[PDB]
Design a binder for this molecule. Sequence first.
Ligand SMILES: [Fe+2]
Ligand SMILES: [Fe+2]
Length: 366
Amino acid sequence: PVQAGTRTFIKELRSRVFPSADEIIIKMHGSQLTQRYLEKHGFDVPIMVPKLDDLGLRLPSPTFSVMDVERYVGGDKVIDVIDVARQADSKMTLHNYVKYFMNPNRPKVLNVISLEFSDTKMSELVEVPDIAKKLSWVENYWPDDSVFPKPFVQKYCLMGVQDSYTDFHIDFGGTSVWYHVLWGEKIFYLIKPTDENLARYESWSSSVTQSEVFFGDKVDKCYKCVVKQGHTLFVPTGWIHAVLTSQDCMAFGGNFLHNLNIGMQLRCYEMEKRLKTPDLFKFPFFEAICWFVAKNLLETLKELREDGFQPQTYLVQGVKALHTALKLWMKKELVSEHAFEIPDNVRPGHLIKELSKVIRAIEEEN
Ligand SMILES: [Fe+2]
Ligand SMILES: [Fe+2]
């Protein structure tokens, strides 16, 4: 059996000529990627922006090194590191990872993919893509007076050695991600979240043979997307993907929830709860933000209704899925595990009623 992450596994991966991600992604200039464009054409496939012009994305020059990351972050910080050949999570001091990274002879393939630095001096060196900030639920609906700590999942520093490999997964909470390669190269294996593919992914995730079964073989198409230096890739809600560091690489990326695919975001959240995924620990208050969002979406629909307008389809679909999720979390036999995420400022039972009728109305008056 070929174990994910091992040298043998990588020889196969590097030799297969998968369908090109050019068959499904949309390439565009940074100025075309607007909230407006996304609301009209949707955000259903990955978007590639080869040049960073007009993205609003700011970051160190191409010579920024891992040594520099250690300076701005602090070698003492303990970080998650993946022992790729064993597909296991380990720990290290940022200091030793950098020592391991610069050592010409690496006894093992180690990868760093969860280093969030918005709480460090390196944060001032990075401004995330404007589009992420425009769409971000956290940027738009997180109150300045919540008891819940604000989630910081917007700035990650990724460093991996050649052949680092991250197996197929869906970003935590169904978030979308922006990913930029500073230097080196990353190759993404993308899989569309069709109802068939999600189902199989959840089955594959809960099978003991997960590490010996290439998930790419269980679906009709697994798209290969090469992300080269200077390029920026945006992956939308629910997309299943694996990543191969084809060569020593440093990249930056971030996660964000938004209003375009709420249903899918909710679906991914529930799946994660069924699989008991450790990633959910990164967006601990997913439910709290959903409550905050339901208040804002309620307001918009109320404003539109009271003035004779019909909301856009995706907004009605999204609110409907939100309504269903909120009602579920409030069920008598389940509310005890959900109550702590209900914001002080919201009235659960009432917010659900208002939502239920605004929806019903739109359903009848249509
Ligand atoms: Fe990912
Ligand atoms: Fe967000």
